Subunit: 312 residues, 3 copies
């Protein structure tokens, strides 16, 4: 059981980039392990999420696939980033909430075979983070600030930072390591995750953004998930599939921004929100697309496996 | 019986269904509790409930549903809350009716909707209606709103905790579930819940209480706490996920507790979300965290979801299961 | 193919009022062309993009040729130019908007499909929404004075004959973001071609929206501006024999919905007021889908089978048996 919870926890981390591999997940943790605190709160979150599915009795295939620890980690991290004694507890409370969300979303999105996506991480964190201004147990970082919207008056730092900011990780190194981590399980996923941040970076420049946040990588977080997800994983990789991904990827950044305003008066983070909308938006469309070949979700595997299975 | 007596028998049932209790008596017992605070509010209630009821019958709902009172619950909270959170006018009544009726189409809309996975509608009909019916105020000056509403961007005194903060809050939580800021009714409404079922009355209690303490822990201004506001939703969570929608157990308990705890956080989060628009949160929080837990249940082996279409009192749900 | 893309484009425009007819659609374009060649272009651009896209992703030809894949394609071509200061990148973004609409519609199709609910203008919005929200942080475009961040807060102007006439037509036009009284007329006529019923219901739409606004006590500026007739017009046209077998009970439902349209219009205005963006078609699509999802549970109410739903007349002729 201990080794399984381990093997699960390791898998959930990789699933962050849709990669179901204990190794990639470990390789990912090693990358992020910028802050021992963050790593702890991560393992806490992942552990809670994992341990929870097992207590409510999920299909072992799902837990052991790590599908029940992914959003478990991002709740462990981001409640600390955006620290008190009650920080840990709330992390646990966040991760666990994620689990009910995922189920809730599972059955939900299931009946058309749409994935849950990071949506569990957010809608949780969202709720668990919104009530701060009225629940003074915690006190928030300078990264949060109520304000009505108002108009405003690099490639290397941003590239890596995009991949890291996917984990709220503002480190160039980990970004590299996380990219390498993605390589292990699959070269394809590591590449698509790259084009992700890059397609997000340039798309941001074009739309004319303050070259601060760009290098900060923020406009590469979601893009990186879009590239990794719609990259051979959820759809049989092709040329038309590529342009779709590019398409989505491009879309990712616009939505990132739009989402920043939407929550600007409430001044909270956008979080993974953008990737999960534009994503689910494209997915729900795929089946109607003849030219587009959706990968059967329940069977969807690595871009390579999804290409090897399809071959015959 | 008769149509008049049926509309009566229905109206009485819808009120109890507020706490998921399908009983003409509990519902009456509930009205009696709230009547204490405002004949006006009682009227606007009966108006709302009546409209909601009468509407389902005109669109032809399955009699089982109307007579189960399932078509009057959200009908009442629209009759009440358009009067409270707004300055009574002559058009107040009409709009109440307009609110209740809207609730009905919402419930249907949500019924077919949430139905195909067997999720309940929950108070969601009351809100999304009232929401729409209340949002456009600043631009539809027919009505003029109470001081309880105020546009403002979010921003981070403490007051003092005490015995009174626990007693006033405990009862006020149950009442604030009906937007009722009275300690007495809270008691009466608790008793009302006892009639139909001791279990539901107890869970509704743990509801407000789990909501009260959870609020203190998260560090809230000890004003609103005693005000009970952070007990409204919690009370519904305790009552709903308490043997009603899931076969009551120990694991089921901790789930409820879990949900209940979650209720308050969401209550707060929701307060912000609507703070710039400065409108009330209303039942909104319970209905989200709730539907969030429900949709999860089936995936949970250890968790035994009560078949919605069959879901009855925690006792009946335990007596039926016994076999 | 060129003539089909034409025949499709023409159809998508009529579908705006649920009318599947190349003629009505043309008649509609002619109406609106009157106000701005630019807007007409951005429209055709949008519609063209939306159409061309479904074909490249391979949609069922029945749907494209029914024009159901160009409707929301037009409103994205128009509104990115209106509620924003035209730039060179205006066109591109239009195209980017229309195309986005298509994935939205699919996304929503499969989505709302499994209960047979329509997509409605929801594709136009959720796109435009996203494509318009990030402006304050994506300074490529610069927005019109019609946009302004502000927390909500409670002059009256004066009601009059002109307030009813300017508003009546403006409601139908404002359904296309068209602030012209003429086109409103023409668009009404356009609706007549395909069907008298749809043209009438679209009328009752704006009118039910107009009065319902007065009653709720609104600043008699926006009313004549017609704004509170846009959504109402869609509600009347949609729930008018098209999506439900037209009757008496069906009428009161429509009226019902129609009345609801305006309240929601306003509420939606607040919801987006701090973010100070437009409400757009948003209101019609919520109160609408709210009523539709209810219909089946209504015995007295006879929902028209969506996949079969046609003109109020055809929906009455088919039913006759």
């Amino acid at each position: 059981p201990l080794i399984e919870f381990c093997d699960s926890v390791c898998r959930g981390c990789g699933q962050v980039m849709f990669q179901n591999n204990t190794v990639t997940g470990l390789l990912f943790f090693a990358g992020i392990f910028n802050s021992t605190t963050l790593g702890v709160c991560a393992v806490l979150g992942t552990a809670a999420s994992t341990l929870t599915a097992q207590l409510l009795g999920v299909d072992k295939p799902l837990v052991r696939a790590g599908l029940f620890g992914f959003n478990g980690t991002l709740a462990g991290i981001a409640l600390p980033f955006f620290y008190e004694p009650a920080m840990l507890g709330y992390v646990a409370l966040n991760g666990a909430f994620t689990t009910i969300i995922m189920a809730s979303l599972l059955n939900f999105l299931g009946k058309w075979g749409v994935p849950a996506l990071t949506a569990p991480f957010v809608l949780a964190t969202w709720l668990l983070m919104f009530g701060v201004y009225k629940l003074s147990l915690f006190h928030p970082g300078a990264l949060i600030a109520p304000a009505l919207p108002s108009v405003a008056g690099t490639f290397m730092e941003g590239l890596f930072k995009g991949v890291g900011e996917v984990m709220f990780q503002d480190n160039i190194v980990t970004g590299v390591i996380f990219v390498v981590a993605i390589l292990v399980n699959s070269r394809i996923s590591a590449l698509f995750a790259v084009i992700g941040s890059l397609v997000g970076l340039c798309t941001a420049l074009i739309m004319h953004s303050p070259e601060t946040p760009v290098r900060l990588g923020l406009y590469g977080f979601n893009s990186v998930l879009c590239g990794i997800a719609m990259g051979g994983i959820f759809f049989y990789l092709n040329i038309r599939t590529f342009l779709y991904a590019l398409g989505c990827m491009v879309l990712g950044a616009i939505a990132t921004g739009a989402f920043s305003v939407l929550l600007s008066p409430i001044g909270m983070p956008a979080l993974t929100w953008p990737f999960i909308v534009v994503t689910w938006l494209f997915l729900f469309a795929g089946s109607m697309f003849r030219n587009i070949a959706q990968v059967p979700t329940e069977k969807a595997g690595t871009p390579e496996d999804n290409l090897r299975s399809l071959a015959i």
